[PDB]
Amino acid sequence: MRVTVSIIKADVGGFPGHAHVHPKMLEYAAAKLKEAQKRGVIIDYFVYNVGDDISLLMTHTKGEDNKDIHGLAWETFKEVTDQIAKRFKLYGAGQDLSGNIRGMGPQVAEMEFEERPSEPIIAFAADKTEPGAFNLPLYKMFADPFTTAGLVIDPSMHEGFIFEVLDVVEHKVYLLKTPEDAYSLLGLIGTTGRYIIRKVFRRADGAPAAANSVERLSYVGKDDPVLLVRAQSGLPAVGEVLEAFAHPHLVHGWMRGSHAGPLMPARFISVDPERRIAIGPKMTRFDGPPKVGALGFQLHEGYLEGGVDLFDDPAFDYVRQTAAQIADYIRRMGPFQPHRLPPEEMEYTALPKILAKVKPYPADQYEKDRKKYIEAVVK
Amino acid sequence: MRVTVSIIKADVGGFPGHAHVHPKMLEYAAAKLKEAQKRGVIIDYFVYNVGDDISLLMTHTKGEDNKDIHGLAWETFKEVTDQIAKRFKLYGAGQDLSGNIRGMGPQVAEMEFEERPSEPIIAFAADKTEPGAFNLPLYKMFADPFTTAGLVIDPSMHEGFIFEVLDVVEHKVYLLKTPEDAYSLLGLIGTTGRYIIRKVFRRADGAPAAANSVERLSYVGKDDPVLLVRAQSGLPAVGEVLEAFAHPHLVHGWMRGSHAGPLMPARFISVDPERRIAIGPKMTRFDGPPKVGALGFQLHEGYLEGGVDLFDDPAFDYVRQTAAQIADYIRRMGPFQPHRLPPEEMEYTALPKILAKVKPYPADQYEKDRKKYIEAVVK
Amino acid sequence: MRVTVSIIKADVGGFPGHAHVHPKMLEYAAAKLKEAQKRGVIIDYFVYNVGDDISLLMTHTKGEDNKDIHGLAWETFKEVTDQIAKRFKLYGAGQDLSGNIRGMGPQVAEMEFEERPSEPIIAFAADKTEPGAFNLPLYKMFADPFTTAGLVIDPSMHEGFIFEVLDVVEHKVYLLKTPEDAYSLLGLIGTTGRYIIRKVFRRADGAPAAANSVERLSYVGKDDPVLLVRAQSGLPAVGEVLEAFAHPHLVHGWMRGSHAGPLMPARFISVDPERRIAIGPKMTRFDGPPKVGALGFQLHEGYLEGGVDLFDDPAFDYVRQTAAQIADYIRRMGPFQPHRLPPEEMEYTALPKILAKVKPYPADQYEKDRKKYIEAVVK
Amino acid sequence: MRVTVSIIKADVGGFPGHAHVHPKMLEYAAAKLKEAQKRGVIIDYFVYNVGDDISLLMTHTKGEDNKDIHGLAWETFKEVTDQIAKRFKLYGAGQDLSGNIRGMGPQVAEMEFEERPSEPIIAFAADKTEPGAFNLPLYKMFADPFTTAGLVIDPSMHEGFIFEVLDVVEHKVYLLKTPEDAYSLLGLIGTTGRYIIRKVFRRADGAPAAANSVERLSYVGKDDPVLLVRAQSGLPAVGEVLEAFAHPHLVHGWMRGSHAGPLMPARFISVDPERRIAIGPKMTRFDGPPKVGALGFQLHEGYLEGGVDLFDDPAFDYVRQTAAQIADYIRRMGPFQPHRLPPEEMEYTALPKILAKVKPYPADQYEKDRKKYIEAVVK
Amino acid sequence: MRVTVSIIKADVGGFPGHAHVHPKMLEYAAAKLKEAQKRGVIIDYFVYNVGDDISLLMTHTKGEDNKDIHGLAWETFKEVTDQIAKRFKLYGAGQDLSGNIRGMGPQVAEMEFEERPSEPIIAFAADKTEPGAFNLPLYKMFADPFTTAGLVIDPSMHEGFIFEVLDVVEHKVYLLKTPEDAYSLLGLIGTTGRYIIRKVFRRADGAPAAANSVERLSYVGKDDPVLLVRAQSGLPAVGEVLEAFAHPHLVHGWMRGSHAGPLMPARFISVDPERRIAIGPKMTRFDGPPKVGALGFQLHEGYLEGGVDLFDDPAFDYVRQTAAQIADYIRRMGPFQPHRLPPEEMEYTALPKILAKVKPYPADQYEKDRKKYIEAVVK
Ligand SMILES: [Mg+2]
Ligand SMILES: [Mg+2]
Ligand SMILES: [Mg+2]
Ligand SMILES: [Mg+2]
Ligand SMILES: [Mg+2]
Ligand SMILES: [Mg+2]
Ligand SMILES: [Mg+2]
Ligand SMILES: [Mg+2]
Ligand SMILES: [Mg+2]
Ligand SMILES: [Mg+2]
């Protein structure tokens, strides 16, 4: 049978600040999805947060961009907002909020496909970063032979992959195929705030392999992303997917959406497959560092067996210790690029307030008058 | 009394991919063994996984290579397969599957002996590696005086040990005795994919000291191993056995059965001696690194008191941190030997697909024509 | 009121080997002491293990070297032996076993004193070492001004301490007073297997400050020790006591009682003040490394409020990581002094078996005949 | 003008063992090349060693595979052999020794081209490894966009490169073009002892970009390699070339040509551009670890201005410290794969001597007779 | 031809203390040996120190234990003593001082053999330790297959080696053969202050492979040692010899000859093969740590070409950093075993002075009187 897997994510209030979510928020969402499952709107679900973002993972048979599924997520987030976030005066209460949810603030990643005889999938959620944070891991798991050994040693993968790249500034899509287009592809997606991988397909048969949440920029579009990846059987192994996160690379976001810091692959605090709820990590120093969580599932008839925390291994403790030490190094740069983002990439700026108060001197005339201008400041 | 201890292990489905097992699989197996114990087929049992492999440890008085015990394991794995693995469409569902189970895919390690006045034993399980992963630890605990201090300072151990070595390619057995044969022995078992220690005996009296699961190659034979070791009282102390795993040496296996990486001695996630179930670690980056778990028991009248996780000590955290850092170093080699295995040792290859598409030039004629062949590629 | 605090410790069976104790052993002991408390034999108790040693801590008003208290401990250990250790065929079952228990194998540390208006005490237990393991920490906490800042900045401590030193070989006691006798004292207790601190008293008033379990050598006397220390109020602060364990110094013991390795200050696995039971750490690589646990109490009318695990702090994680790395370094020496102990200090040896089989040559005559003796070995 | 740059390298004696060369060897060679330059046989030269291998770098206008240039190198190595190596009884004296030198033992890497308006080149020499040691760095600098940023951001490099791959076992050449053929290429050159990059050309114009010394296997062919690379101006920058050595990856060779260990990028002990002599590093522990040296030049009219030691930077000290720590880790595996090489890849073996002395048992019959065979060894 | 290589070493004065030698001492010795070579007493020589010990290496054809060679060394050391050490009042001036020099204080290691077609040898010198410091490296390079890969993969080495072991207390020699006698051998040489390897021979042909300086104890015998090892060609490779020093194991010696600390493999400060002089490292913190230097040579007609500093490699910098960190760890134990040596192994003691001043109490009577003895100390 054909199944759709959809992640719809929003931040409708943090606890405290942007550090975490209130646990009653997850419990409310899970109860609401349980009711929807009872009415047959969806087949199955899982609810979790990383930081201050709640991801609603849902399986169903309504296809991509379905108004009922996008509305079910909208109503669940509006109800959490009124019943819990506003009640407790959470920070940023209801702030991510017919009939497509895309472009309103919440993030969506969805794929529809024929359910394979084994259907392993991984759901990722990152907090304190932008969709282009997943550019480097998506490139690596689908096109770097130092990450995905299948590209070289699995004859089923030799033909490579098709990347759908969205220019979020001019609203243009590019289709690039690896291996042959890898340098062109990199020329684009290296600019992570502009050219973002939105979907990946297998080149042999066109099968959907990943979907990243990304929307054109309009302030919406740099919101914290969610990502679905299918694995095995001509698609990267679960371990090759996870290998692409094993270097905690610098991403854009972190405090005030205006800095660069390492993406730490974090464990969940708890995973309860019966209650269908996982509680992800907090954001602390400098509102981060940015973190990504990974929950694995196996699908059957659309039922989600999982989730399984796939960064829960001593091997990833090395990678978390690297990210903790790189976060401390980079923070000693304070307000300066490239720790602070380029001026047109920062979410926060006071540059207009500054340039309104500080007097400029045309530089040619300034040369003749420097001595008197300094004497004036001195006196 | 004489008792047989048998480990029969299989992978009948992973969760997700090859990362872990579904916990209902262990619970089903334990219930089935509880029923068998009720009917007197076995005396006692313990069920656990490391990675995606479930080990059924059973004590009984039916001897080695018993059809009823091997059939009890087959039926338990077939029932887990139909009731759970196929139901949830687990990855590799039922894939390791009259009347000897050996050579069908599952792995068996068994020993029969007179139960000593104290009978401490350790059961090991490794995932993402081959039986020859245990060649270096078995050599060390029975024959390296830098590991087992008893060989030098315990007069009961001075005569050494007999190693039964199986050539899994030509199906030939060798018996070598240490100390005198140590260099010949190493000449063989250094080639870990060909010459594998299958059993070890005490030289003083011929008493069985260890049994490793290994079968001739036929695709079966490189499956993830299980190992039983008896300890103390003329056999290495429990700590000398565990010392032989304290260097996380490179083993063959890891992603796609085609790479080398460090064997990490891991803790179990949980050990429940009442329910007779332990849940072992997951495999994550690059489908590993490979890991080994160690559960200790004391036998009485064949009853298994335990298990006790014997890598659960801060001292082994150093060894796990070494393996995490060596896994990161070696992975930066990507597709190249010796991180990727020698071509006849890899489980995965696309070499036939490559050599079918890429044109060869006999090297002597190529010398005269190089300039035109390059001009042709250029134009 | 005057109270006696007594620790009586024994190993009556390990689980498996010498790695740990069976939890039913602790539960049996605690039930037996609960019954004794009901009959008024003792006031209060706490039962715990470190490694394979069970410590019975008891408060009562019967004084030091009391036959009823020493018999209560003997009967509790004999009952654990018959009901549990022999039943489960534990390793070394009942092996540490009228009317003084001292010198029979179990270890005793006891102090009687007037209960102070606040009476904080710490109970330590070490496994895989000898009583002289506590020589360096006892010296430091009572006489090193780099450990105990009170010796310099607390005028109540300026007069120092009296150390009672037992020569366990010739059965002689020495009383030495610090600061003035510190070099003589060190001349003795630096030889940790011969001269051991048994008790410490405050010099101002003669008040008992510590008691270490140590008996003359007879094979008994090197058994794993237990230690009581009173703190505060003219005695070292609780933190100065714990500071004296913050360097994980090399001790004698570890595998086969015949090696030197670092004393790791370990956490307890669990502390249950209501059930009056703590479960200490396991011994793993090479049957260790040696470890010490520390449980704090406050006494009131002899009741023991606690215990509190006093090595449970991230600051001691540094000290545990140092001990894990020093255990790995030293183990690469294998069979050689000074990792292996001096020949008269080792618990295990095969030297008589060796010297019975290997031919000696008087060294003067050997010089003339070397060439023919080598030609003979060669031919 | 057109110029040929040739490196001809040989080991004609070590000092001591295979650790280093005698400095008079370099001085003799440099004097002999000075004489040849005087007669116009060559334009310029530089003489250096890494370990026990002496590289003669020569520029001239006689083209590739020239008998006079190959004979000049042969006569220089034969003269060093008779005058110095045999005189001092150096180890392996004259052992690498009409009219092509290729396949006789010495290694040759040569390129002819039109000298560019700036012509920067780098000469590498590795000791204790095989030509396929340079497979991973050559792939990285010409085809990995994580190494060579020019592939993505330099439009002159976007078309990629042509790799000439020699199968040294069946004597077949393959031409593969990146980016499109990168997975096929890796499928071959990952097997470093069989498929070795011999030359690289620019795809835009066919210009020679690198040449590695490699010959078919015949015992000759695994000898320690030398490599020339041209840089800049549509070819990788000097820093991109050096970046491809910044991970000290495991190579085959080291002790007895039979182990795997990390390739350390080493400094030269001294570089004397006036005397035209550099003295490279020694090989010490375990006859290594394997090391590579890098000398940069700028060519003018064929004159060699340099050399410049291009691993002489604190940034490469990190990479040398990584290789020193990985050499210590891997050496603790001793005689076992994958530290010891696969049996058909090792230069040293005693397997025939072993199999001549150790009795085999056909494995089927052995099963019935195990008990008596063990009783026989025991008795 | 047959050649003898002799090292005769002495400390005839330190500069300052025991830290180093005065450079004029080496220059005087080298001039005196140059004169002896002129008269044909010796063929060749090299003079060097490690710490405060000067080694005279000499080749000649007078055989082992030659009065003229031993007298030439005695006269050179007596002349250095009178002309330089006494003149400058060096510390320990002339203190190591017919007709065998052995047993008078200086140390001798010598071997005579037929000079092979290549004859590589290594001379070692250790300061601040005892001859048994070389027990662990000599065992490893001749009998541990984790050090010397030739024992397994070189059929010329398969028969192993003969160790001549001197009991320096009872003056008895033992001959033990590896592999078969390795556990007996270790049972002895693990006790490094009693059983010391004096010579090693090849078992195939009886050829001398190493000689360590060691004399019976009489105070003489624990003096800082010197060691000659021949390498290659059925004897361990130069790198296998050096691998046996790559773990900086704890040795006895260091301050006052009474402590244990790590043996650091050190570089020489300078090596001048023309002047025939090397200046070794200093001893600093705590008069060490103990250090060993290694100089390689190649012999021709008895001429010594070298020396070459064979610990001069970044790979050994890791090993020196390990020894520096282990020296800091162990020194925090201060006066306690096992950092301080066992009482009968220390060169320094004040135990008689202590036991003369501190009053003993027979331990049985002390029990009754403890309270009054403490009251007496208190009052
Ligand atoms: Mg927020
Ligand atoms: Mg967020
Ligand atoms: Mg599997
Ligand atoms: Mg598995
Ligand atoms: Mg015990
Ligand atoms: Mg114990
Ligand atoms: Mg050589
Ligand atoms: Mg070489
Ligand atoms: Mg001196
Ligand atoms: Mg000295």
Curated annotation (Swiss-Prot), chains A, B, C, D, E:
Homooctamer; dimer of tetramers. The active site is at residues 11, 219, 222. It comes from the Archaea. Keywords: Carbohydrate metabolism, Gluconeogenesis, Hydrolase, Lyase, Magnesium, Metal-binding, Schiff base. Catalyzes two subsequent steps in gluconeogenesis: the aldol condensation of dihydroxyacetone phosphate (DHAP) and glyceraldehyde-3-phosphate (GA3P) to fructose-1,6-bisphosphate (FBP), and the dephosphorylation of FBP to fructose-6-phosphate (F6P). It catalyses: beta-D-fructose 1,6-bisphosphate + H2O = beta-D-fructose 6-phosphate + phosphate; beta-D-fructose 1,6-bisphosphate = D-glyceraldehyde 3-phosphate + dihydroxyacetone phosphate. This is Fructose-1,6-bisphosphate aldolase/phosphatase. GO terms for biological process: gluconeogenesis. Mg(2+) 3 binds at residues 222-224. Changing residue 287 to N: 18-fold decrease in FBP phosphatase activity, whereas FBP aldolase activity is completely abolished. Changing residue 219 to F: Shows unaltered FBP phosphatase activity, whereas FBP aldolase activity is completely abolished. Dihydroxyacetone phosphate binds at residues 18, 128, 256, 287. Pathway: Carbohydrate biosynthesis; gluconeogenesis. Its cofactor is Mg(2+). Mg(2+) 1 binds at residues 11, 18, 52, 95. The keyword Hydrolase applies. It comes from Pyrobaculum neutrophilum (strain DSM 2338 / JCM 9278 / NBRC 100436 / V24Sta).
